[PDB]
Amino acid sequence: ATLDSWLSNEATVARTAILNNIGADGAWVSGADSGIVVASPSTDNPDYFYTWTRDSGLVIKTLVDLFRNGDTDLLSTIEHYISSQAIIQGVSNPSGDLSSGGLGEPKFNVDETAYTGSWGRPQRDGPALRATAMIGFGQWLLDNGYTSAATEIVWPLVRNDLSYVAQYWNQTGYDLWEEVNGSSFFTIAVQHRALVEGSAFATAVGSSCSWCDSQAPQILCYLQSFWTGSYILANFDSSRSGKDTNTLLGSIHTFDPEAGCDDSTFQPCSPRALANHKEVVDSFRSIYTLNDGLSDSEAVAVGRYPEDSYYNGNPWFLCTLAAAEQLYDALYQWDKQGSLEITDVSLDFFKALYSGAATGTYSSSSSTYSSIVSAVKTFADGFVSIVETHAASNGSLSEQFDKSDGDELSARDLTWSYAALLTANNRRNSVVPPSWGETSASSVPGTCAATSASGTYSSVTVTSWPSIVA
Numbered sequence: 001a002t003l004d005s006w007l008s009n010e011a012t013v014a015r016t017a018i019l020n021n022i023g024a025d026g027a028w029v030s031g032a033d034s035g036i037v038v039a040s041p042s043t044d045n046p047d048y049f050y051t052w053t054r055d056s057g058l059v060i061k062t063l064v065d066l067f068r069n070g071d072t073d074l075l076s077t078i079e080h081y082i083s084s085q086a087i088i089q090g091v092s093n094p095s096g097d098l099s100s101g102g103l104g105e106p107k108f109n110v111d112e113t114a115y116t117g118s119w120g121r122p123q124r125d126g127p128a129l130r131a132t133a134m135i136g137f138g139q140w141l142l143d144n145g146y147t148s149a150a151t152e153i154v155w156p157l158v159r160n161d162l163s164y165v166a167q168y169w170n171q172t173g174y175d176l177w178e179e180v181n182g183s184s185f186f187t188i189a190v191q192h193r194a195l196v197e198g199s200a201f202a203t204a205v206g207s208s209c210s211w212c213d214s215q216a217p218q219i220l221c222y223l224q225s226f227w228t229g230s231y232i233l234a235n236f237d238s239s240r241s242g243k244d245t246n247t248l249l250g251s252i253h254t255f256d257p258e259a260g261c262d263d264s265t266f267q268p269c270s271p272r273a274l275a276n277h278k279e280v281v282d283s284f285r286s287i288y289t290l291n292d293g294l295s296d297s298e299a300v301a302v303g304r305y306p307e308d309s310y311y312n313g314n315p316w317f318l319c320t321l322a323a324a325e326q327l328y329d330a331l332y333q334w335d336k337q338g339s340l341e342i343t344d345v346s347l348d349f350f351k352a353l354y355s356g357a358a359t360g361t362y363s364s365s366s367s368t369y370s371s372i373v374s375a376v377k378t379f380a381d382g383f384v385s386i387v388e389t390h391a392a393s394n395g396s397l398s399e400q401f402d403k404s405d406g407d408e409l410s411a412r413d414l415t416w417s418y419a420a421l422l423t424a425n426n427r428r429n430s431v432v433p434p435s436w437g438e439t440s441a442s443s444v445p446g447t448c449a450a451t452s453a454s455g456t457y458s459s460v461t462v463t464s465w466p467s468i469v470a
């Protein structure tokens, strides 16, 4: 009643707020160039008035999906983004130049100039995310007869990012939270996905990605090492416990609606992703006063990692939403399959929600299935109610919400917060993203090798966009 309604409304605010944070007509970000996604309009305490390759990549993939589903008015936004990326790719920065590491640079100034101070660089997820966002649009272009745009503009840009992923996946860098210098799950997971989908896209435009092909199975191989036997290790080279919403994000951003409950790829309904979900969420239950009194069967406010001290370490809107989004994704998957399986690995996850849980297979007409899917949906929705509870009255969503009183804190109107609302809502409604080919890319090689493949680098110039109609 309350929730369903709040969401319809929030989805509208979320779409507007996002556009307000994109140049060069964005109402909140005067100064940002055309196609530049600003993290937040907050210029002071904290200063988030920059454009991050990850943030923009995530937001744009979200907008691309809205567009393909009928939000035709987002066309110019997407086109501006792509054109801005042709320029950014060639900007010389502390990470290097186009062909010498430049692509791994985390953030840039909104005016498209390099950010030259000290930063946790490089961040190798960036290029994989940007490539995923473009491939989605490039697919639309091929399907609607704009073959030339797809082949001469998108492909060349994706080609750069994919060469980067193939070349450096096997090197340390900073995590998505920009603090741990090592090897991180999220990064590895989104890289694997980009290579696979880059390869298919390349073939579709009449070309190839030999380096996509040789490296994908190796990244997948390596990805298996993050499973500890209990949960997904967020990063190697860390002294933390390793329980981090990074791993939830990793699953949801690599969710393929055609995939079964594959452990190799950590799908939302995979026993490993389910076991992981409980361990990560449970880590926040006793550290936030806001969670005081809630039982193990109830949704709680979720932060990044239990050890977080950032602004004292508080719940984040996007983290809380990720916790719900994974569940909506699993429900979808179970429904499509027509069954749900409970294993020894996922028993704790299920039992906390449905105390009569026992291992076995449960068809969709079975009493147990109905019992579990209801409890799961209720649980997922509870995460969303927490968000509704703490959002501003006009719908404004901040980065964080206070661990004790739930007031909004840290960067205001965070673009990533709004994109996270949209995808969770979509998933809640059975609106899923296009497949990335997970079904021909979940086989793990017998032996993992520490390797790379060098692709090719070439600067792209976007002279003009054909007069596309949608």
Ligand SMILES: *[C@@H]1O[C@H](CO)[C@@H](O[C@@H]2O[C@H](CO)[C@@H](O[C@@H]3O[C@H](CO[C@H]4O[C@H](CO[C@H]5O[C@H](CO)[C@@H](O)[C@H](O)[C@@H]5O)[C@@H](O)[C@H](O[C@H]5O[C@H](CO)[C@@H](O)[C@H](O)[C@@H]5O)[C@@H]4O)[C@@H](O)[C@H](O[C@H]4O[C@H](CO)[C@@H](O)[C@H](O)[C@@H]4O[C@H]4O[C@H](CO)[C@@H](O)[C@H](O)[C@@H]4O)[C@@H]3O)[C@H](O)[C@H]2NC(C)=O)[C@H](O)[C@H]1NC(C)=O
Residues within 6 Å of the ligand: 013, 017, 027, 028, 029, 030, 031, 041, 042, 043, 044, 045, 046, 049, 392, 394, 395, 396, 408, 409, 410, 411, 412, 413
């Ligand atoms: C829902 O409603 C909310 C509530 O109104 C809307 O949010 C508000 O949006 C406006 C813009 O439309 C923001 O205005 C901008 O404010 C900053 C200053 O912000 C700091 O100070 C604020 C006030 O400080 C005093 O008053 C408060 C009020 O009670 C006291 O609490 C304080 O103690 C002080 O006494 C303060 O409110 C701000 O806090 C918010 O942000 C922080 C940090 O991110 C959060 O932690 C907080 O929780 C809180 O959310 C903040 O501390 C100005 O700097 C901005 O001016 C720039 O932009 C103008 C145009 O937008 C321009 O005219 C100016 O010249 C200036 O331009 C410069 O900066 C731009 C970048 O932003 C550049 O692009 C530009 O080139 C140039 O360099 C602006 O005035 C409000 O801060 C914001 N308020 C809140 C509470 O968030 C919200 O948008 C609505 N949502 C929807 C979906 O509609």
Ligand SMILES: *[C@@H]1O[C@H](CO)[C@@H](O[C@@H]2O[C@H](CO)[C@@H](O[C@@H]3O[C@H](CO)[C@@H](O)[C@H](O[C@H]4O[C@H](CO)[C@@H](O)[C@H](O)[C@@H]4O[C@H]4O[C@H](CO)[C@@H](O)[C@H](O)[C@@H]4O)[C@@H]3O)[C@H](O)[C@H]2NC(C)=O)[C@H](O)[C@H]1NC(C)=O
Residues within 6 Å of the ligand: 169, 170, 171, 172, 182, 183, 221, 222, 225, 226, 227, 228, 229, 233, 235, 236, 237, 238, 239, 448, 449, 450, 451
């Ligand atoms: C480049 O690619 C190669 C090839 O894929 C990568 O090499 C593999 O590296 C993984 C990760 O180190 C490694 O797996 C380790 O094997 C050890 C021996 O079998 C294990 O002792 C070790 O255990 C850690 O991880 C477990 C989960 O897998 C945890 O349960 C366990 O507690 C350990 O975790 C703690 O210790 C680590 C230290 O390794 C610490 O950083 C953690 O934060 C945590 O505190 C691993 O299982 C494979 O054996 C390697 N494979 C090969 C063929 O050598 C290489 O890492 C890649 N390099 C980069 C930078 O990407």
Ligand SMILES: *[C@H]1O[C@H](CO)[C@@H](O)[C@H](O)[C@@H]1O
Residues within 6 Å of the ligand: 262, 438, 439, 440, 441, 442, 443
């Ligand atoms: C993931 O993909 C592999 C093929 O690479 C399949 O064997 C598996 O069944 C799943 O579809």
Ligand SMILES: *[C@H]1O[C@H](CO)[C@@H](O)[C@H](O)[C@@H]1O
Residues within 6 Å of the ligand: 217, 440, 441, 442, 443, 444, 445, 446
């Ligand atoms: C599944 O396919 C992979 C490649 O994607 C192989 O390396 C593996 O051995 C299995 O045949």
Ligand SMILES: *[C@H]1O[C@H](CO)[C@@H](O)[C@H](O)[C@@H]1O
Residues within 6 Å of the ligand: 449, 450, 451, 452, 453
């Ligand atoms: C890394 O290793 C693989 C095989 O182990 C090679 O094929 C590759 O060229 C790189 O040297």
Ligand SMILES: *[C@H]1O[C@H](CO)[C@@H](O)[C@H](O)[C@@H]1O
Residues within 6 Å of the ligand: 166, 167, 168, 450, 451, 452, 453, 454
């Ligand atoms: C990636 O790194 C490998 C090293 O294993 C090189 O052989 C390859 O040329 C590329 O630089």
Ligand SMILES: *[C@H]1O[C@H](CO)[C@@H](O)[C@H](O)[C@@H]1O
Residues within 6 Å of the ligand: 099, 167, 453, 454, 455, 456, 457
């Ligand atoms: C990897 O190595 C190849 C071979 O030298 C280069 O052409 C490519 O630019 C990348 O550096």
Ligand SMILES: *[C@H]1O[C@H](CO)[C@@H](O)[C@H](O)[C@@H]1O
Residues within 6 Å of the ligand: 455, 456, 457, 458
């Ligand atoms: C790698 O390959 C691309 C395209 O095949 C070239 O344009 C580039 O100069 C490099 O040789």
Ligand SMILES: *[C@H]1O[C@H](CO)[C@@H](O)[C@H](O)[C@@H]1O
Residues within 6 Å of the ligand: 156, 457, 458, 459, 460, 461
């Ligand atoms: C490498 O490839 C790009 C994309 O086609 C060109 O713009 C550049 O001139 C070089 O041939």
Ligand SMILES: *[C@H]1O[C@H](CO)[C@@H](O)[C@H](O)[C@@H]1O
Residues within 6 Å of the ligand: 086, 087, 088, 089, 090, 091, 098, 458, 459, 460, 461
């Ligand atoms: C490719 O890179 C060149 C510089 O090497 C740029 O001038 C061009 O704008 C594109 O970014």
Ligand SMILES: *[C@H]1O[C@H](CO)[C@@H](O)[C@H](O)[C@@H]1O
Residues within 6 Å of the ligand: 458, 459, 460, 461, 462
């Ligand atoms: C795109 O094309 C222009 C030439 O028309 C180059 O100068 C630019 O670097 C990019 O390759």
Ligand SMILES: *[C@H]1O[C@H](CO)[C@@H](O)[C@H](O)[C@@H]1O
Residues within 6 Å of the ligand: 460, 461, 462, 463, 464
């Ligand atoms: C538009 O025009 C420039 C100059 O010829 C090209 O380099 C660019 O790739 C696009 O075709």
